[PDB]
Amino acid sequence: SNLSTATVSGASYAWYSDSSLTSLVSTAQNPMIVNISTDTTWYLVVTVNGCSSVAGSTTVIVYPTPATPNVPANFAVCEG
Amino acid sequence: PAQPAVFNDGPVCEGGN
């Protein structure tokens, strides 16, 4: 999925993997998150002219797993 | 001025890029 945030003049974008903001995942206004298997939250700190704001965030929600198909029981057929 | 961050675009398959 592709996240999208505000473009701010003078800004530096820091994306983090956790609300603790100790480890980076990316640096972009529109980063891609890949191989998503669980709901995942990214946090964003925008620093403008040296001023770092409160991180914003959003959670990418993973669609439910589709149901297993209904097929017939083991069968047997006679040749021909 | 500062050490840059460098990011990969994911795992690469052997012989790829």
Q: From the CA of A15, how many Å to the nearest CA of chain B?
A: 12
Distance CA B14, CA B17 (A): 8
Of the candidates A3, A10, A2, which has an alpha carbon nearest to the alpha carbon of residue A44?
Answer: A3
CB atoms under 10 Å from CB of A26, counted, come to 18
Of the candidates A19, A62, A61, which has an alpha carbon nearest to the alpha carbon of residue A44?
Answer: A19
Resolution of this deposited model, Å: 3.7
Q: Per the CB < 8 Å rule, is B5 touching A27? A: yes
Q: Please say whether the beta carbons of A71 and A43 come within 8 A.
A: no
Distance CA A32, CA A53 (A): 22
Burial A32-55 (b: 16+ CB within 10 A, else e): eeeeeeeebebbbbbeeeeeeeeb
Expt. technique: cryo-EM
- Residue A68 to residues A11, A78, B7, B11, Cα–Cα distance (Å): 48, 29, 38, 31
From the list A24, A34, A35, which residue is nearest B5 (CB)? A24
Beta bridge partners, A29, equal none
